[PDB]
mmCIF file of C-alpha atoms in Angstrom:
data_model
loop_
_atom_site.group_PDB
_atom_site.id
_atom_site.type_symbol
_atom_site.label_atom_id
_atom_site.label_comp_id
_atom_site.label_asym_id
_atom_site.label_seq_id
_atom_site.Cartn_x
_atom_site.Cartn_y
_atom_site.Cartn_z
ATOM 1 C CA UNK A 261 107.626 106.492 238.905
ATOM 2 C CA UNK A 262 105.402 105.940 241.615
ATOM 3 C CA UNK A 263 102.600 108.201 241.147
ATOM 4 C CA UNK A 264 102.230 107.091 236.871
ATOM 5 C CA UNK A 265 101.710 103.193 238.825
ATOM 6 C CA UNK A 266 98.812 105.179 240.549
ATOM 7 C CA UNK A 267 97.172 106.450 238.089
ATOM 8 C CA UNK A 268 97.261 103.455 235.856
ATOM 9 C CA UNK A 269 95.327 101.787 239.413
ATOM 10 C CA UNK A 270 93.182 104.367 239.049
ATOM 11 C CA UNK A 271 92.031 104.731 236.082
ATOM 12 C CA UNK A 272 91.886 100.912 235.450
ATOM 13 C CA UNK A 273 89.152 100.804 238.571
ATOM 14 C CA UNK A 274 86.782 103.428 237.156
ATOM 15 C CA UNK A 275 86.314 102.112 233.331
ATOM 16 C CA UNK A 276 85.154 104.006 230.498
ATOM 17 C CA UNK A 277 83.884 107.588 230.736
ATOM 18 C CA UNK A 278 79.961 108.161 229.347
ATOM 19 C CA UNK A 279 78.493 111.529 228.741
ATOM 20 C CA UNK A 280 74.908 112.898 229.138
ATOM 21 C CA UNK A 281 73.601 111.821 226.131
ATOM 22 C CA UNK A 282 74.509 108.199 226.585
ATOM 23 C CA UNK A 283 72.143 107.960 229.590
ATOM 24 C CA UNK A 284 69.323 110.150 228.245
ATOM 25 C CA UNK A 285 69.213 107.290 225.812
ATOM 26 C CA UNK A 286 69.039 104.117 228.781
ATOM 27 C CA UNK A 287 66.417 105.972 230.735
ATOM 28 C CA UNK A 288 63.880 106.126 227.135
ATOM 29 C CA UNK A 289 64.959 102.650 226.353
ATOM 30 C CA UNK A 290 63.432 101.462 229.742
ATOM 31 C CA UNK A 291 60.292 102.595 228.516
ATOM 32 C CA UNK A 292 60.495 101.018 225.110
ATOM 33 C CA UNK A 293 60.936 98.001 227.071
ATOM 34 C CA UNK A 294 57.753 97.744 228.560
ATOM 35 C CA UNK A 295 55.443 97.888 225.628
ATOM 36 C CA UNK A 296 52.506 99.624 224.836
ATOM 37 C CA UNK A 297 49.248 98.701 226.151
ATOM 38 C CA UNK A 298 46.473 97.738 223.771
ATOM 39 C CA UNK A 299 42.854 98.241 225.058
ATOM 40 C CA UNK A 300 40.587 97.365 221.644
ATOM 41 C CA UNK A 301 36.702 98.406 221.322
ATOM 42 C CA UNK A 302 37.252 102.244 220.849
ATOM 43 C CA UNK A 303 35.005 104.039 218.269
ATOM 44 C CA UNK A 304 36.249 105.424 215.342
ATOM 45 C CA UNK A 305 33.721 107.457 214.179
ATOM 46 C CA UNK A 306 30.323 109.427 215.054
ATOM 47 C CA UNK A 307 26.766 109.990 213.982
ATOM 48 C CA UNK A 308 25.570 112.838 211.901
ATOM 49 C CA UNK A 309 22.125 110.976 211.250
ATOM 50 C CA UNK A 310 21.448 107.833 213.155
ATOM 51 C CA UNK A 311 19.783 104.953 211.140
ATOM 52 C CA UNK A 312 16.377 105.075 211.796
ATOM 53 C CA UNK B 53 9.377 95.291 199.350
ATOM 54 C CA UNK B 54 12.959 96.725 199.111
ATOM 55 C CA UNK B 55 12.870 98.835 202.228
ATOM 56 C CA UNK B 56 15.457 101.630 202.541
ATOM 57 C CA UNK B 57 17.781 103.059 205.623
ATOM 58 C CA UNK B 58 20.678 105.717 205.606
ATOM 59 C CA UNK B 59 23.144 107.226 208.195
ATOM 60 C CA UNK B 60 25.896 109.940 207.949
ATOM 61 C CA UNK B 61 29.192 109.762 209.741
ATOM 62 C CA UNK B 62 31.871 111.979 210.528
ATOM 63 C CA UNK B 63 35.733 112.086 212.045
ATOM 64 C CA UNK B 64 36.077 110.949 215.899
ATOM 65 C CA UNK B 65 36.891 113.132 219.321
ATOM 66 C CA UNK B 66 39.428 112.789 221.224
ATOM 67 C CA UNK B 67 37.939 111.551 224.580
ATOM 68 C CA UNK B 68 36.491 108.318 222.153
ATOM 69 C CA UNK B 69 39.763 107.008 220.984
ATOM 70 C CA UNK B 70 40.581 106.003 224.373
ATOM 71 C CA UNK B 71 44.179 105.201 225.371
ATOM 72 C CA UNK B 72 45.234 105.149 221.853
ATOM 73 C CA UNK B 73 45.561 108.748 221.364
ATOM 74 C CA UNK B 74 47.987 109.163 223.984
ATOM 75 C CA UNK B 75 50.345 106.135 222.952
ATOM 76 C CA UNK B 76 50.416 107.372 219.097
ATOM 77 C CA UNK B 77 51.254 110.716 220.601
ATOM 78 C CA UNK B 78 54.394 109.244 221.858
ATOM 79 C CA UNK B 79 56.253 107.757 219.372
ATOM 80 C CA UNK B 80 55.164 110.477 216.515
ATOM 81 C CA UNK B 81 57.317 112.973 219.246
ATOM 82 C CA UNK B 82 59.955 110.594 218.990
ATOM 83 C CA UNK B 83 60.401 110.822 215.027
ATOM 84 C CA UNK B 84 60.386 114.777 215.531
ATOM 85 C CA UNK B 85 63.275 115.175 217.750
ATOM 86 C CA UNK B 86 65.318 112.520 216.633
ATOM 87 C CA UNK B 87 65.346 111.075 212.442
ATOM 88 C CA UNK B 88 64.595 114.523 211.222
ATOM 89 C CA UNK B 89 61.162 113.654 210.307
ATOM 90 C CA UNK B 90 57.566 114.721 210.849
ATOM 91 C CA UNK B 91 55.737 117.768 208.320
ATOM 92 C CA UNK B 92 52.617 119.379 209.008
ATOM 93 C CA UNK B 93 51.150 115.652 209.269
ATOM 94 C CA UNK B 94 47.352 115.149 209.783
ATOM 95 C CA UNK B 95 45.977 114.466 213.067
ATOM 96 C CA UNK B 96 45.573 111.329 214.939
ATOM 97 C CA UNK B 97 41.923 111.601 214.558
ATOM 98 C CA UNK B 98 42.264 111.819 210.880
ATOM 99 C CA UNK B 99 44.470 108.974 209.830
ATOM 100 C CA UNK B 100 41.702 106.571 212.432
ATOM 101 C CA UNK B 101 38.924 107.815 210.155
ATOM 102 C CA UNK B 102 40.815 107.178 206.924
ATOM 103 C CA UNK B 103 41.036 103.449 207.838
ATOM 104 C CA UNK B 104 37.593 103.708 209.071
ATOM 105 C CA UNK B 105 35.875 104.408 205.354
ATOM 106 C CA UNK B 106 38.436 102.157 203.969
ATOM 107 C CA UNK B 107 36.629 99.140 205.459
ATOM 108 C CA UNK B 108 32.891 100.124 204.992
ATOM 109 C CA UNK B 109 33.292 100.448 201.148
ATOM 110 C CA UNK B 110 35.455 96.753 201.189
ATOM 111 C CA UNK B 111 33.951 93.992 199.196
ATOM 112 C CA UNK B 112 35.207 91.622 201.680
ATOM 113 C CA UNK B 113 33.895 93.142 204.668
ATOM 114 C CA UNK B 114 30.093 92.841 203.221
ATOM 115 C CA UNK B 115 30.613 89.791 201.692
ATOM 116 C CA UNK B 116 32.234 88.532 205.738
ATOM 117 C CA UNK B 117 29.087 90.295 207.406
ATOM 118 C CA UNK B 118 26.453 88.348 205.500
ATOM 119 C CA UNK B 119 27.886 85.211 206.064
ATOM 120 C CA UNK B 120 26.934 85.631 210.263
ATOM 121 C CA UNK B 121 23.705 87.993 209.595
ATOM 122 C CA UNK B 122 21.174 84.817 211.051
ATOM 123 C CA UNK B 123 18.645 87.428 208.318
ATOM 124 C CA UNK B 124 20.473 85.173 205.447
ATOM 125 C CA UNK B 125 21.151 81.805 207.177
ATOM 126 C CA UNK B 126 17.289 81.544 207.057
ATOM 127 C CA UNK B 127 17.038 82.143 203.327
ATOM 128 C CA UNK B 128 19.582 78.994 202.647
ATOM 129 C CA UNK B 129 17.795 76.819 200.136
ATOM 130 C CA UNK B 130 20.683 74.406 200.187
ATOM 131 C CA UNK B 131 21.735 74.393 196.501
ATOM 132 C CA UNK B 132 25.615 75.755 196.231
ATOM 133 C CA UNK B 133 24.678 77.708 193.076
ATOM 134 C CA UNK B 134 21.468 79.107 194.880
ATOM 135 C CA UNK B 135 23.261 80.017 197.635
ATOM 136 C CA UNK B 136 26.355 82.058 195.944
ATOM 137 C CA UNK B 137 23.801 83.666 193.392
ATOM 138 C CA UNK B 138 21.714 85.100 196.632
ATOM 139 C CA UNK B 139 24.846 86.140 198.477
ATOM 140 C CA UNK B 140 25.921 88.212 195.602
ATOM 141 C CA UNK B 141 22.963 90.050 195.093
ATOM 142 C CA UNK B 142 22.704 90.636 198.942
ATOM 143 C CA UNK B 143 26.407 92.751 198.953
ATOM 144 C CA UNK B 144 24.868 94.607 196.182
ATOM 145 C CA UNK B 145 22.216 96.104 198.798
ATOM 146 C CA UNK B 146 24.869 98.053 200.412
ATOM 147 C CA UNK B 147 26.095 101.270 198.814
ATOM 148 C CA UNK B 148 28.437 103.540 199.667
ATOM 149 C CA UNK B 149 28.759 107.603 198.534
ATOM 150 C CA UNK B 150 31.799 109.134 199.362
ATOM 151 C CA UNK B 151 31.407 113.247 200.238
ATOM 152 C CA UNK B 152 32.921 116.495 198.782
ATOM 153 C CA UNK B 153 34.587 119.010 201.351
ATOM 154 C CA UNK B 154 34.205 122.155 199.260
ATOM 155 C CA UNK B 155 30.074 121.748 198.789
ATOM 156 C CA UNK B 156 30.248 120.695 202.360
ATOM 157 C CA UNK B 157 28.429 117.027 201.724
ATOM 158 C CA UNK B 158 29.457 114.372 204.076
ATOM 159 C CA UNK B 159 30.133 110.241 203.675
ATOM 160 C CA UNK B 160 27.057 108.225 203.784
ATOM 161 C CA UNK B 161 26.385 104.764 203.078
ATOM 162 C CA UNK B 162 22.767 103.027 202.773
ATOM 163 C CA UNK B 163 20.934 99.593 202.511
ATOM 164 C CA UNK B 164 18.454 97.731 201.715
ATOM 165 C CA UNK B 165 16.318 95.051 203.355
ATOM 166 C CA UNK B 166 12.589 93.374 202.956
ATOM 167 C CA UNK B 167 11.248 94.760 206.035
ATOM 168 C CA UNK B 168 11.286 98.141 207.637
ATOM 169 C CA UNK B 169 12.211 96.946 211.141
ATOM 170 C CA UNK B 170 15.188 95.310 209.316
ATOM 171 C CA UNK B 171 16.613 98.013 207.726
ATOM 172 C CA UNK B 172 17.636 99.668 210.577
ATOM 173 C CA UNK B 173 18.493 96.905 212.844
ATOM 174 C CA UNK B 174 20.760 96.000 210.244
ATOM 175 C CA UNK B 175 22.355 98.930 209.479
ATOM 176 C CA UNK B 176 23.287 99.733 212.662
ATOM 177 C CA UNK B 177 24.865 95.756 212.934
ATOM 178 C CA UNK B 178 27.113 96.575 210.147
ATOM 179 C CA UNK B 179 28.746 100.195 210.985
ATOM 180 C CA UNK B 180 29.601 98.567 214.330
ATOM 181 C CA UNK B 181 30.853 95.625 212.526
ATOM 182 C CA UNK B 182 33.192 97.709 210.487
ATOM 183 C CA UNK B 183 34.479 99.706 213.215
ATOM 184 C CA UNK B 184 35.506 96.823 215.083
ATOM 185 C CA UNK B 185 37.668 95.484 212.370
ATOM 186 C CA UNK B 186 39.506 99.423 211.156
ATOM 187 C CA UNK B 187 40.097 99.262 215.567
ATOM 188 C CA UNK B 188 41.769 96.056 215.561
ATOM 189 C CA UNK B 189 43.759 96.948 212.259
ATOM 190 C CA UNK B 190 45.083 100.075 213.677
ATOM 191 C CA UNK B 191 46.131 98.439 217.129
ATOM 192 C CA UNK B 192 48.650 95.940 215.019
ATOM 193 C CA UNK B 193 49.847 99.331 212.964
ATOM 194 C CA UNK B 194 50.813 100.424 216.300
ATOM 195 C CA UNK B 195 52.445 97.216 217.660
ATOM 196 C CA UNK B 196 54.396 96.998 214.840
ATOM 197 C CA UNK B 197 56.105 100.408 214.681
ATOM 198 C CA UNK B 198 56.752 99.917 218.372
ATOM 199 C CA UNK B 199 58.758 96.855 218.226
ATOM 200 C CA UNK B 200 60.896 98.802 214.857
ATOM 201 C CA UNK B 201 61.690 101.717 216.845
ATOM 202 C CA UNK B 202 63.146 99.589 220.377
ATOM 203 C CA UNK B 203 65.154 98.018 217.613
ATOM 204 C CA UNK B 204 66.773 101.016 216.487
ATOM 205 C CA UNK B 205 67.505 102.578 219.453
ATOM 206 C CA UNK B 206 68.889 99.394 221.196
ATOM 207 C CA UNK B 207 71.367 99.318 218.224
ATOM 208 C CA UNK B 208 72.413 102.675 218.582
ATOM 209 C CA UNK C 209 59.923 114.288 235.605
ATOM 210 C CA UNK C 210 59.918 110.870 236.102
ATOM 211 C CA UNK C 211 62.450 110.415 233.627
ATOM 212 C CA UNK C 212 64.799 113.446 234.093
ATOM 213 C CA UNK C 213 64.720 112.281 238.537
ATOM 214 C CA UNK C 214 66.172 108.503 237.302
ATOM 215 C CA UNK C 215 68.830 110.259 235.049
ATOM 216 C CA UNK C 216 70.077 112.463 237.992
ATOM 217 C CA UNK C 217 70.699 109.685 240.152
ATOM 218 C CA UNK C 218 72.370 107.273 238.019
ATOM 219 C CA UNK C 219 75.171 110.488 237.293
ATOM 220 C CA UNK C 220 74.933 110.965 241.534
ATOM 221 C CA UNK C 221 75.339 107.297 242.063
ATOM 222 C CA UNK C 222 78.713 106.934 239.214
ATOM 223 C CA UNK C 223 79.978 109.796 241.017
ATOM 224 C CA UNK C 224 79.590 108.201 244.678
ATOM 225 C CA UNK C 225 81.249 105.201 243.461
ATOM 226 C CA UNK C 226 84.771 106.867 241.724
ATOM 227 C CA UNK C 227 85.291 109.092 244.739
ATOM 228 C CA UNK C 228 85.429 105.239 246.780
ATOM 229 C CA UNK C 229 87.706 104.410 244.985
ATOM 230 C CA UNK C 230 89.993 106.713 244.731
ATOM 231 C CA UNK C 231 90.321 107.269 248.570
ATOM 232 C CA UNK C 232 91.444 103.464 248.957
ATOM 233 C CA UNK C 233 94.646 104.193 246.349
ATOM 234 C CA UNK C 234 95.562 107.110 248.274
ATOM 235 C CA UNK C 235 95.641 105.773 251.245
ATOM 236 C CA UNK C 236 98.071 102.759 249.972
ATOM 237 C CA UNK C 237 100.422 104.829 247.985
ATOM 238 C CA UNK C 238 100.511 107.460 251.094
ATOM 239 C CA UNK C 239 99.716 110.763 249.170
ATOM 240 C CA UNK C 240 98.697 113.553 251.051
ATOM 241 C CA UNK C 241 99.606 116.776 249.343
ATOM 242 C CA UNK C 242 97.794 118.478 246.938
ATOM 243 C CA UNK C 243 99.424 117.590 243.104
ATOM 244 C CA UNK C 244 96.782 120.014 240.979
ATOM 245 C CA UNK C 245 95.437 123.130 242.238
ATOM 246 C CA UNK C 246 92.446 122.339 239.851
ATOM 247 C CA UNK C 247 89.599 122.332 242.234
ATOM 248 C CA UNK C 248 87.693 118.887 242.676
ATOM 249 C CA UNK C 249 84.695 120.303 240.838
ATOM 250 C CA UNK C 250 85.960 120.427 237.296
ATOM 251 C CA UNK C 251 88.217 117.347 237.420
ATOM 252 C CA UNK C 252 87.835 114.238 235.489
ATOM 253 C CA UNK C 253 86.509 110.884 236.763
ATOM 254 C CA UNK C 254 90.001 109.092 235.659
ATOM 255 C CA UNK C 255 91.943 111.590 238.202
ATOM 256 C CA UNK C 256 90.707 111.620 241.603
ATOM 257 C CA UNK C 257 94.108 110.174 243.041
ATOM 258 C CA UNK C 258 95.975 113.883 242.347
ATOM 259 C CA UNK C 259 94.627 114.886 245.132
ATOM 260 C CA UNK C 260 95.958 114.321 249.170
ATOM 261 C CA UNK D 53 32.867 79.400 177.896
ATOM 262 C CA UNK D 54 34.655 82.660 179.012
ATOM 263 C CA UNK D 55 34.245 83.182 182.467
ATOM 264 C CA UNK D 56 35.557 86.074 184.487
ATOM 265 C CA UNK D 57 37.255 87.525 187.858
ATOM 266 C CA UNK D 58 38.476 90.640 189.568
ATOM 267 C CA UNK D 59 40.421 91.689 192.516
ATOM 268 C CA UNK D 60 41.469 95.098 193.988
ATOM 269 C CA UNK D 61 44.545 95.940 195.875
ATOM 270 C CA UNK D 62 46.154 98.695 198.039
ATOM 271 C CA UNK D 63 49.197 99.496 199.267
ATOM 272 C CA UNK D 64 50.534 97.133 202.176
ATOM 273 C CA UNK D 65 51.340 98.129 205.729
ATOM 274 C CA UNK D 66 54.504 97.970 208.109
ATOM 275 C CA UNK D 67 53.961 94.713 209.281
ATOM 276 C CA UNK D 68 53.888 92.131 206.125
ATOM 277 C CA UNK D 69 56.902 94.425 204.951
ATOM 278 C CA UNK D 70 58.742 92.082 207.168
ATOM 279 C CA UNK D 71 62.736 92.922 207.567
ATOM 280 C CA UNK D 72 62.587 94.987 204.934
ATOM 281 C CA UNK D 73 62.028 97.647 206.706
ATOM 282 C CA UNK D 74 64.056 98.083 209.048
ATOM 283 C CA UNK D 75 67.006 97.931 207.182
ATOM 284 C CA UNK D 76 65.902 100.215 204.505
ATOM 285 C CA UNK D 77 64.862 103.535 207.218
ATOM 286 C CA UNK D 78 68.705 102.248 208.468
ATOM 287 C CA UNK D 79 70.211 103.509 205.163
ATOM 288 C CA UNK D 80 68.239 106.646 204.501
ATOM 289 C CA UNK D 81 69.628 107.855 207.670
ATOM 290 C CA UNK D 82 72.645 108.142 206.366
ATOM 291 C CA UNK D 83 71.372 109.877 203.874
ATOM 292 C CA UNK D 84 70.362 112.096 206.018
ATOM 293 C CA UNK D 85 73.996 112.977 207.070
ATOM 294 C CA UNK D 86 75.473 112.990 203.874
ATOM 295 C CA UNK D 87 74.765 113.454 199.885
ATOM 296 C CA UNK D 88 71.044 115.393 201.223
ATOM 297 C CA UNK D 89 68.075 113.893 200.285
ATOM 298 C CA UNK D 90 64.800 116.007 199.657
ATOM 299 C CA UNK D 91 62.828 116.357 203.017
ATOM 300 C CA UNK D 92 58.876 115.066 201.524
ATOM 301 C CA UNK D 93 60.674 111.839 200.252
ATOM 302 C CA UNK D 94 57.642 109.198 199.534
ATOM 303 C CA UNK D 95 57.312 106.575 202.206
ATOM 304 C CA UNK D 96 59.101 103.326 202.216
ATOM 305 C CA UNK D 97 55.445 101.917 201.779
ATOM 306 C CA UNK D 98 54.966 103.966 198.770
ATOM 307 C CA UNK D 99 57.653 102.749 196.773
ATOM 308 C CA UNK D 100 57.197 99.081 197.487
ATOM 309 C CA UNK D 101 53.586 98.923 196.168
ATOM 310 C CA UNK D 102 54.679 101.339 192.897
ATOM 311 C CA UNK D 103 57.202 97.843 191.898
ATOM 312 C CA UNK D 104 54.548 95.834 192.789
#
């Protein structure tokens, strides 16, 4: 009897269990959260024969 | 007079895309390992030059880069029907020739002007004109694939 | 590496937090013997308490 | 009289394709996992502008 009411205390005070893959995941997302950074007037192209 | 110009261009380097390169990198890596996705794609450097010719040989974009030249603003009679009929023939002066990779001939485009110091001060106007609008389109291609993907992993 | 140091702590930090825990319900319930001979390395996060 | 116009089109891109999209990638996932699908599939893209 008394030890089963100490492991239901137990077990109710530590909540789910997660693996690794479930926090690979919330370290990327932090990332994702930021957004990207746009920076415009970069060439997308060059010169074979300049206009002369 | 009908004076003549003509320039050549090729695919971009790496260290003149800028920041964008890297960022692209990223979420391409992200479709490999996860979505079972990604082939032997092209490059980064040659999807930017695909969109690149795609706006040079656009009707709209010569028919937009007229309209702020300041060479046609002075050539405004002030007739509506003038005015269309002279814009029309003015896109006209801009022609595009796309190359062939097996006889090793690249893209070039060419125009023509009344004046020789105009040809080439225009010309070079436009090219930067049209690379300014294929850099702004591909910076929205990228904000939009950004926001999908943080909404399919915050689901998951 | 920035990435794979923030994943390493938030396991280290879940694991700091369970063994807390656990030591409080032990103390209350007045176990002191060893229930499992399982060593503490391999045990599950849910079952601290069989232990003195 | 007869008078005349012309336009030219080209495929769209990811962002007028609105919600669309989303939820369409959603379901070929799936389809991923079950009932295979052929791995050079055309592109979600693709197949809107071919109804179009």
């Amino acid at each position: 009897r008394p030890m089963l009411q100490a492991a239901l205390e137990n077990l109710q005070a530590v909540g789910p269990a997660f693996d690794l893959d479930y926090d690979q995941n919330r370290a990327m997302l932090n990332t994702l959260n930021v957004g990207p950074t746009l920076d415009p007037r970069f060439q997308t192209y060059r010169y074979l024969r300049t206009p002369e | 007079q009908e004076w003549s110009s003509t320039a050549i261009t090729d695919r971009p380097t790496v260290n003149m895309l800028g920041g964008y390169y890297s960022q692209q990198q990223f979420l391409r890596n992200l479709d490999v390992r996860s979505n079972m996705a990604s082939a032997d794609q092209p490059s980064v450097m040659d999807e930017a030059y695909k969109e690149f010719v795609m706006q040079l040989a656009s009707w709209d974009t010569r028919r937009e880069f007229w309209l702020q030249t300041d060479y046609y603003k002075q050539r405004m009679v002030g007739n509506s029907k003038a005015d269309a009929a002279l814009l029309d023939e003015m896109i006209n002066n801009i022609q595009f020739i796309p190359g062939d990779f097996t006889r090793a001939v690249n893209d070039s485009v060419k125009l023509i002007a009344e004046t020789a110091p105009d040809a080439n001060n225009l010309l070079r106007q436009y090219v930067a004109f049209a690379s300014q609008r294929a850099a702004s389109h591909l910076n929205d291609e990228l904000k939009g694939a950004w926001a999908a993907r943080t909404i399919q992993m915050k689901a998951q | 590496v920035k990435r794979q140091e923030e994943v390493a702590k938030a396991i280290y930090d879940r694991r700091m937090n369970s063994i807390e825990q656990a030591l409080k319900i032990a103390e209350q319930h007045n176990i002191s013997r060893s229930a499992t001979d399982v060593p503490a390395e391999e045990l599950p996060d849910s079952e601290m308490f069989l232990l003195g």
